[model samples]
Target: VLPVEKCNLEDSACMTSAFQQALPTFVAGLPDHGVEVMDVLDLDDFAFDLSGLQFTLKEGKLKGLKGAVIDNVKWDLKKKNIEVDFHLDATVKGHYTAGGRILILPITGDGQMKLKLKNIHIHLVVSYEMEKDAEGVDHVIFKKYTVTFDVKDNAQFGLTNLFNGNKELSDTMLTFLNQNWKQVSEEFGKPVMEAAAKKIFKNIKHFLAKVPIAEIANV
Candidate 1:
């Protein structure tokens, strides 16, 4: 069996540079991963009127999740851990059902309850494990992934077809949503983030499978 200690990929400038150069190409090919949208996510606890909701990638381009930055990465040989810090510029466009009363405040008045979001930042930390295949070939397998959503800049949230051009109520709802962005992310956005991360890991794994471990370690 191939020992985990023999498969260490140390953190270095060369390795980071290699990833910087290689990641964009990898990300650019994500649209072809054969999946455009994640599974319908359930957020019953968040006061969302709908029991089921979903997000679709109308355009699966890196233009949304741009600027692939690997802040730090290390493959812990002794612990068989692969830790990485990665960030990107994200622009997501999707709509979800949003009928709810926030402390006696009614949303989705007389029209369909749908909310949309655009241009939010997505930060991620991907953790992986080093495992040996049945043939003794070492591989990196996804363990867990954490995501942080930053909506402070260029981020827009609005209610659709509400108030018949009543900007005041729409702005109020928009403000409320932005103020409660963190809670919204924790309650509803995390699953979507994780699903996307899993797909990314799959793509990266597929790419790495073709390269020799020695070459990966050397980078």
Candidate 2:
């Protein structure tokens, strides 16, 4: 068990520190507790298919999640308001194949892809209720949640073989992607990160469902 003490909802600092300790354990995975490993968060099989934009990515891996830091936690059980703020710097690298039109120019690639994101901020809001299980144990049941993510710093993207062995077009596409990262990301990044936040919340729901609220909170 973690050394975290049962905390009052008002004891926000303790909750933050509690998260600090819990994160590493969560990253390491709690097989016995039903939480899966998330240290790197494999995305190799989850292809990025934005057909409307004519872009797709296959065979990818995401890293840097273990470095997540909780900036703050705001909890108000009475008002049924709970919010969290966190951030992380992440890197995504994998052998990727993408075909699309970048900035009005036709583009196609069948090679490596990389996305470096800096200071990615995640904001979460969730509501929960206590419900009794078959064993008469009170458990925290998360009913509703919404997450928002913002990239506070620069984000870069890279793709090889954009022109199938043509160096000039390949270099130009890479440069364009990196230089216009903000717009490119604004157009494409939201779907990925929002899904990521919701995924973590799903794990949180499973964890809390098993470990009653009283175990972690002193209300």
Candidate 3:
């Protein structure tokens, strides 16, 4: 339980104080009981599962990609919102169908593809509120969220088997993908982040419902 008896969700200072006092305990105890504040909330590591990713490219289609890990997560408490900073280490494995433009580059195959990305930093500002159900139970909810990705400074990106075993073609495609990581991040990053946010909100509501917020505040 989080100590929210003193929390007036409408009062910015009260909210901040309550959260500031409650967060450390909540974070430290995450592994014992478990909280979905993030998709993977282990104290040492955090990750976002991207198994359902499906994206269309100019020439091909990417599907069934999975495994994107956020290696670092840092948070800052603010008056109105919590600011988050993290870096993504994504290793997506799936099958890609090469057609149209991609086929013109001598990479014509409908086979497996693996993409590895590192040092892709991301930032987010999130605001929360309490919503009451018909039963008058308070549920913590995400009021607003904004995120940005920064992939400059030559963040490493590696691709393999896009050419179905042709090293020459694989190198070319990898270079193209590496050079355009920002664009790729924009297209593939949103749903993963959105899914994580949804899980966090859902878990927070459940946590509050089960454990009285007042009980947690005193801990």
Candidate 4:
């Protein structure tokens, strides 16, 4: 079990340090705590549709999440609001099947796919309310969470057999995809990043639920 330490909820430094201390173990995963391994989590199969092409990615694997570093944690106990600033780098790899058109150009493929998102900065805001659980103990129920991210360095994308073995067309399309990688990254990276944040929040909720507020903070 992750040990709990009581701290002044109003002390941002203490809160941030608390989070920093908890992160490494959390990301490594604590299934006993209802948290899954997040460092190299498996991604849900997803579909991407853009401009006219539709692609389905399967067997997805996300790497480098354990590399995340939390820079700050701001807790507004008065309003029950919290803000977190962190950064990470990741790569998603999988097999894909794509077809249809790319702005009037015909495209088809069923092969390996990859995307790299580097130096990502994420800002997470959460609002919650105090509530009584089944045991009549007070718990923080998350009201809403908002996540925003930016890939500051670079994003790379690639798809094999994009033209079904037509090396010429496949390579050309790959070039096009990489050339406009910024837009492509936005088209595909957002949902996964959101999923990552969701997982983090879920882990937090589970961890917090098991440890009542009184155990971790002076309310």
Candidate 5:
């Protein structure tokens, strides 16, 4: 954990740097939430534009945590005429990945706030080439894919928090999926999506680290 206290909090530059650094690398870093496109356009060749990917931050999940801070983020509801400014007072989660650097909270608390996503555009370009082994049989195609994320306010959302969101939405998974249109968007099968679910777990670590105390811990 980095010593945030050592830095001059009064310095806006330092504070901004801390906020940017706290953002994690991957959403898979979460506890339960998953990642995937709506329809199947070839796991290795597709692009998706996602929006309204929201989650509510409630009490039990956001008790004790600190050291982390919520900077500015993006919120756009194309369906509703409510695309405006929103801070972390109610929704204060970010994206992240495992083995990635993130900002632990300097304080924490949970309430009825939601992280409103303006747009989440994902582009996946996949390809495969035929190759032979010692046996000279068509044993491999060497599949590979490149994923690009275009995030606005939040380059990443702490997956750890996403995990908790998954659990809360579990019983209503079907309804949630239907409402979000994320599940059926690209016809993203469950297998690939499950692999990307790690983001949720990643979020739990940073977002709800000190749940018991209602603050983000200074990891």
Candidate 6:
């Protein structure tokens, strides 16, 4: 029998970084096959598995792809963030000597709470000995520095937080819009997008003007 107060050390943070780095690389490596549009039924909140990535390399330097089989994995995006801590049951293919390997990462974060640094610290760990083999490869190995990732919606210096102390950045975006009209419209034909570009440019300009400069100029 185990002590009621203690649980297994299976959720250790240090153990999760190995696979974290590989996942992003895999996502980055994916060929831009436009995703198929689907209906937004009640099935939006389910988790799905990933598989089948094939790549080809011109030189013997980096691995390139051929094709991959990513199993369906569902996700809930009501949280308004791209942070990894929210993703669970994801698998990557075409990593380190193909035939493909599967790594099941553990996600840690509260989905219901507001997004912030305190809540967005998503750390990942991976182990080669603990995975599935597919196609052909037998084993997968990882680098020594395993744990790493990108953090977003960080309450510390994120968009909302950064916009708080600095009025210039926000105001400059507006100013920039006023300065550039034809350029903005040319890029985005949509009326709403054009309007937004102008507004954003204006705000950014005003914001830049407020920032302290190394040299002062007089007119």
Ten-residue segment with the worst summed lDDT in candidate 2? Answer: 43-52
Most accurate candidate by lDDT = 4
- Model 5 stretches with alpha carbons more than 4 Å out: 1-104, 107-116, 131-142, 153-219
- lDDT tens digits, residue span 1-219, model 6: 111122122322321342232233332422232111111101112122223211111111111111112222121124211112332211111111111212221122111211112222223232222122353332222211122322222222112222333556534532443344333223221322222223323332332233222211110
Candidate 6: which stretches are off by over 4 Å?
A: 1-25, 29-120, 130-136, 141-219
lDDT of 5 by residue, 117-170 (tens): 324343333333333435444321223434443323331122332234454533
Q: Which is better, 2 or 4, measured by lDDT?
A: 4
Candidate order, TM-score descending: 2, 4, 1, 3, 5, 6
**Which candidate, 1 or 4, would have the higher lDDT against the true structure?**
4
| TM-scores for the candidates | 0.60, 0.87, 0.49, 0.86, 0.20, 0.17
Mind sharing the TM-score for model 1? 0.60
Clashes of 1: 0
User: What is residue 137's positional error in candidate 3, in angstroms?
Assistant: 5.5
Q: After superposition, how far is residue 35 of candidate 5 from its true place, in Å?
A: 15
Instruction: Give me the displacement of residue 32 in model 1, in angstroms.
Output: 10
Tens-digit lDDT string for candidate 4 (102-188): 654588999997778888888999998888889888887777899988888888877787776999888877777777777766655
RMSD of 2: 2.3
lDDT (C-alpha, whole model) for all candidates: 0.49, 0.74, 0.47, 0.77, 0.28, 0.23
TM-score (C-alpha, index-matched) for candidate 2: 0.87
Residue clash pairs of candidate 2: none
**Model 1 alpha-carbon drift over 4 Å, by segment:** 1-8, 30-63, 101-104, 109-137, 146-154, 162-168, 179-188
Task: Give the per-residue lDDT digits (tens) of candidate 2, residues 119-162.
Answer: 98888898888798888778878888887777889898777677
Candidate 5 global lDDT: 0.28
- Give the candidates in order of lDDT, highest first: 4, 2, 1, 3, 5, 6
On residues 1-219, what C-alpha lDDT tens digit does candidate 1 reach at each position?
111222236654554555666554454453443322222212222222222322332222223443546666655656655556555445333333434543334555333323333444555555666667676766666566666765433333444654454778877766776677655655565545654566665556655554445545642
lDDT of 3 by residue, 51-123 (tens): 3333322221222112232333333334545555545454434434443343123334455555545655666
Backbone N/Cα/C clashes per model: 0, 0, 5, 0, 65, 45
